[PDB]
Amino acid sequence: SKLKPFFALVRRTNPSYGKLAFALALSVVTTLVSLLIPLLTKQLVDGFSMSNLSGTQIGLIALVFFVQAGLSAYATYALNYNGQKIISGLRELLWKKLIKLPVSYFDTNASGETVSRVTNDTMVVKELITTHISGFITGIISVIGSLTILFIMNWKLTLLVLVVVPLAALILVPIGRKMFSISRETQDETARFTGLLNQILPEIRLVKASNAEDVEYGRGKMGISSLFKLGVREAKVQSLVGPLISLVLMAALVAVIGYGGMQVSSGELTAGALVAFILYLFQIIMPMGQITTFFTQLQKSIGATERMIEILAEEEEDTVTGKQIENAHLPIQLDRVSFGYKPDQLILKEVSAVIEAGKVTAIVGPSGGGKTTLFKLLERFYSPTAGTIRLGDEPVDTYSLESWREHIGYVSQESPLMSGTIRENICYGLERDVTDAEIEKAAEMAYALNFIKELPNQFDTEVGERGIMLSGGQRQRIAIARALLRNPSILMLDAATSSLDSQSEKSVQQALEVLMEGRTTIVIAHRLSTVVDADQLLFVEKGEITGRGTHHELMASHGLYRDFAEQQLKM
């Protein structure tokens, strides 16, 4: 059944089903060659006297090894190469989907867990396909055909003793499991002792100050004594297991080998059959581990595939919405917007607001209310189900979300840089324009080129893999220049105006007030600089609008009664 999802995925990785079959059959004939190997040695033993035909048989055996090696090598290379093509396809599709579609909240599920899933689960799937789909088939064919050749070579003989030996081995194994259990308890208790020590040391200050080194020495002694008793336990078990292991194993080996010798010395027809038997039981034992490993890893592989298809399931979309985009200059309207999170959580309720077009307007929200949610609603990652943010007499959703975000003036103080150089900022500003060679021209025009440390270079200025060797204000003004470059039509502001002085704060304030004056400006912050800057301001509390109007007597009085208490809470 799970083969259905597994094959669905490998079908999503579409083009190598014939080469894989080639590889599998070549591996099969490889194992058959390995089966052949003993018999030529058997003939060699049969010759036994002269060197000429013995030399010919040596030639044959060397040739057959060489064929086995070459063909097996080709099979393995083909298998792994195809598998790496497969894994390339998997990662390509997965990354494409995972970046393109899934709107913000899904990556809100987790951060490192997703990329971890991708990496490790892809690796497991690939190793599975190539190594284990080889190994299981080759080994099972090997072992069944091998016991068959044993039946042919040996009757109701020294193959029966062989098959009863692992009976005793299975009787053996649980003893090793018990040893493993005691070992587990051992590192468990050692970790306990380590934790006790970790607790004790940092407070050595109070320990000494109390003159209580003696009771602590006693605590250590107790812990050590407990570890000592457990060590004695492990000792007893280890001693009664190990020699028992050696006993049973060596004894069974002696039984097998010496009973074969009993056959050969008796004149039974087993002397080159004996060398065949030893070689060939060797080839028998070699591949059992592969069988067991496949049996184990199948479960994890299938779970991984389930995870993969789960990640592939969900969907999102952006230009698909429409093309009804216009000049995008109209007041933003929130109409009875109640949609928040999952319809059963309901973090929002009927939130309605009117912000005039081309007007600087900020918001104020509580630390733990709905301010961040209203932020993510203005930036419109969430899909309003109950509420409606009115724009353009209801094409607000209808026109391309890509076109709308193409008008967005996104900015935030937290935002570091994408890895690389300064040019990549405007390359991100690319919208099939590339801004030609108006890139540095605009950098100059809007104050950005005046500022990145006298432009050490226009392209070689490496912003950093992470961006450490640059400060916050620098990157924030880089971003504001980027947004001014993109489209200076609709501006949002997280108000990246924090501790960047009174030089850079006013710098970005005039940047938004001059370059972005007539067009729409939206601010979200906590300080009074933004509330006095904005022409209109609204206030949000318990996930509901609780303030409106201009910001002079209105917001002063809004403060005075309750918002002043809120501010005093902030300080």
Nearest residue (CB) to a second copy, 167 versus 215: 215
3-state secondary structure of 361: strand
- Nearest residue to 136 via CA among 296, 328, 338, 350: 296
Distance between CA atoms of residues 222 and 534, nearest Å:
69
Nearest residue (CB) to a second copy, 108 versus 292: 108
Distance between CA atoms of residues 232 and 226, nearest Å:
10
Q: How far is the CB of 114 from a second copy (least distance, A)?
A: 7
One DSSP character per residue, 431-482 reads SS-TTTT-HHHHHHHTTHHHHSTT-S-TTT-EEESS--SS-HHHHHHHHHHH
Q: How far is the CB of 19 from a second copy (least distance, A)?
A: 14
Nearest residue (CB) to a second copy, 161 versus 207: 207
Q: How far is the CB of 375 from a second copy (least distance, A)?
A: 11
Report chain breaks in the chain, C–N > 2.5 Å, as residues after which they occur. Answer: none
Nearest residue (CB) to a second copy, 123 versus 528: 123
Classify strands 420-421 and 462-464 as parallel, antiparallel or unpaired.
Answer: antiparallel
Nearest residue (CB) to a second copy, 10 versus 401: 401
Distance between CA atoms of residues 258 and 276, nearest Å:
15
Most distant pair of Cα atoms in the chain: their distance: 117
Nearest residue (CB) to a second copy, 27 versus 338: 27
Nearest residue (CB) to a second copy, 310 versus 356: 310
Q: How far is the CB of 7 from a second copy (least distance, A)?
A: 23
DSSP letter at 201? G
Sheet holding 351-355, edge to edge: 351-355, 332-337, 388-390
3-state secondary structure of 545: strand
Distance between CA atoms of residues 509 and 529, nearest Å:
10
Q: How far is the CB of 224 from a second copy (least distance, A)?
A: 5
Nearest residue (CB) to a second copy, 65 versus 349: 65
**R_g of the chain computed on alpha carbons:** 37
Q: How far is the CB of 308 from a second copy (least distance, A)?
A: 16
Nearest residue (CB) to a second copy, 332 versus 555: 332
Nearest residue (CB) to a second copy, 196 versus 298: 196
Counting other chains too, the contacts that 455-460 makes at CB distance below 8 Å and 24 or more residues apart are 458/422, 458/423, 459/421, 459/422, 459/423, 460/421
Neighbours of 76 (CB within 10 A): 17
Tell how far CA 284 is from the center of its chain. 39
Q: How far is the CB of 204 from a second copy (least distance, A)?
A: 6
* Inter-helix orientation angle 3-12/52-100, to 10°: 80
Distance between CA atoms of residues 442 and 246, nearest Å:
81
Q: How far is the CB of 355 from a second copy (least distance, A)?
A: 19
Q: How far is the CB of 541 from a second copy (least distance, A)?
A: 25
Q: How far is the CB of 250 from a second copy (least distance, A)?
A: 7
